[PDB]
Structure formats: structure tokens, C-alpha cells
Design a protein around this ligand. Structure first.
Ligand SMILES: CCC(=O)N(c1ccccc1)C1CCN(CCc2ccc(S(N)(=O)=O)cc2)CC1
Ligand SMILES: [Zn+2]
Length: 259
């Protein structure tokens, strides 16, 4: 009952999920001069193994890579977090055109895409869906994508997109190391927020990396080849699958660095 189209998109989600208008909603516009330098934060560590990936799926809203999360091998820790959070999946949000697509903005600027690495507190909660209910349940690391030079590791991912072009399709996707999609800096902004899709639960500690990664225009194009639609339906391309910035409502954005 929701999507990113004219009639079912983000401005209407509150008709289904009233928490859409809550006090802890994501994404936000990060005003870099208004973030609080927080030197008490621990270093951010993205401790990822190379062969924990399972599959790549077009779920009708994004393309998503799922991981084995049966133990704390592939985790985020430090920064704002109390203890390790296990990687469940990563996915992307992107635009129809090159000047939009990210969920977070920085001083009003959008990027063409944003990667979300979705982690959960498996030490405290039984299931991902239980963690997704709780204020301390999830940690999402956001990485901006800009267009520029070709990204070598991204080729594996963009070559796999053909086989998941239609909604509801999946392919095996082994030995993809998500560390390959990280920038060389671990500087970040962090704030308490929400899932950016229904059910919009206010369960996420956001960690938005300062430094983007680069992919080529050809690579960005392969994302726009994906479809919102199943094999038999009139083709609608998967583009503009982002929620825009939400009201800060007095939350504190912390920064690991001085701007
Ligand atoms: C058994 C039912 C069930 O498990 N769910 C459910 C289904 C229908 C209605 C209510 C709950 C859940 C399905 C997964 N979902 C979270 C997915 C998600 C969404 C956005 C991000 S982002 N963009 O913020 O990084 C990251 C992760 C939590 C609820
Ligand atoms: Zn997301």
C-alpha cells in the first residue's frame, strides 16, 4: 500500500503509518555548521568479512544484498554504539536524474545515490524484527555515492542487476565484501532517527559517513535499469526511491570531526 509514485509516495505515508509525523524521523538535512563535535565518541569500526553475503534481491523498493547474521562476524561497533551490531543487509536509494537520489542531504545538497548498511543489536534482541521496534535496536551506516571514476568492486554488483531487473526476483551473491563500498575515511555524523520506509519505526542510530564513494555514470545507469514492476506488468523503472528530509525536532546531530 506504499511506494514512491505520485499517489503512494512519501507525502502520503502518514495515512498508513502516523509515526511518519513523529519526533525521530529520518532522513534529515545535516547542517554541517550546526553539528556538535563529540570527541567522547569511540572510533567507528566496520569489521566486515569477505564471504558473508547470500543473495541479491529486487524487493520492489530497492535492490538489497542479504548477509548471514547468525553470529557477530560482520559488525559495526564504536562511534555512538553500545556494543556490536550485526550486518543484516545493504541496499540503495537513487534518483531518476543525476542531481537527486540520496535520502540524507548535507547543507541542502543531494547526491545521486545513498547506500544503507543495515545492522541490528543481536546481543539484546532475538530477531531483526524485534530489534526494528526498539530505540536501540538498529544501526544504519549511510554512504553517499557521487558519479566520477568507475568503482571496481561495484562492477560485480552492477553486472548482477540484469538478473534481478524485475520486482520479486533474486540471485545468489556470494563473497561480496561490503568493506569494498566504504570510503577511506571513518568520519561521520550521528543522530537518533528512524527507518526511512514503512513502518518508519524510530529504532535507528544513524551513522552517516562524511566522505562519499565514486561510481561511474555507466554503473549508476545500471541501477536505473531496475524495475518497480514484475515481469508481466507495463515497465516502470525503479528511480526516485528516496524519502526526503524530515523535521529535526530539536535532535542533536553529533560529528566525529570539526568541519
Ligand atoms: C514480519 C513483519 C516484518 O518483519 N516487518 C514488517 C512488515 C510489515 C509491516 C510492519 C513490519 C519488517 C520488515 C523489515 N523492516 C525494515 C526494513 C528496512 C527498512 C528501511 C531501512 S533504511 N532505508 O532506513 O535503511 C532499513 C531496513 C522492519 C519491519
Ligand atoms: Zn535505506
Amino acid at each position: 500500500g506504499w511506494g514512491y509514485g505520485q499517489d503512494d509516495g512519501p507525502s502520503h505515508w502518514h495515512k498508513l503509518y502516523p509515526i511518519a509525523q513523529g519526533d525521530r524521523q529520518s532522513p534529515i538535512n545535516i547542517i554541517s555548521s550546526q553539528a556538535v563535535y563529540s570527541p567522547s565518541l569511540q572510533p567507528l569500526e566496520l569489521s566486515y568479512e569477505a564471504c558473508m553475503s547470500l543473495s541479491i534481491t529486487n524487493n520492489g523498493h530497492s535492490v538489497q544484498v542479504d548477509f548471514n547474521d547468525s553470529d557477530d562476524r560482520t559488525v559495526v561497533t564504536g562511534g555512538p554504539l553500545e556494543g556490536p551490531y550485526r550486518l543484516k543487509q545493504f541496499h540503495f536509494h537513487w534518483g531518476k536524474k543525476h542531481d537527486v537520489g540520496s535520502e540524507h542531504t548535507v547543507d541542502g545538497k543531494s547526491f545521486p545515490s545513498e547506500l544503507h548498511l543495515v545492522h541490528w543489536n543481536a546481543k539484546k534482541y532475538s530477531t531483526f524484527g524485534e530489534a526494528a521496534s526498539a530505540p536501540d535496536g538498529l544501526a544504519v551506516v549511510g554512504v553517499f555515492l557521487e558519479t566520477g571514476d568507475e568503482h571496481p568492486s561495484m562492477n560485480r554488483l552492477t553486472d548482477a542487476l540484469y538478473m534481478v531487473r524485475f520486482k520479486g526476483t533474486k540471485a545468489q551473491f556470494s563473497c561480496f565484501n561490503p568493506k569494498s563500498l566504504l570510503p577511506a575515511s571513518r568520519h561521520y555524523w550521528t543522530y537518533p532517527g528512524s527507518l526511512t520506509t514503512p513502518p518508519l519505526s524510530e529504532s535507528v542510530t544513524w551513522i552517516v559517513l562524511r566522505e562519499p564513494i565514486s561510481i561511474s555514470e555507466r554503473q549508476m545507469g545500471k541501477f536505473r535499469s531496475l524495475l518497480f514492476t514484475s515481469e508481466d506488468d507495463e515497465r516502470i523503472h525503479m528511480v526516485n526511491n528516496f524519502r526526503p528530509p524530515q523535521p529535526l525536532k530539536g535532535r542533536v546531530v553529533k560529528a566525529s570531526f570539526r568541519a
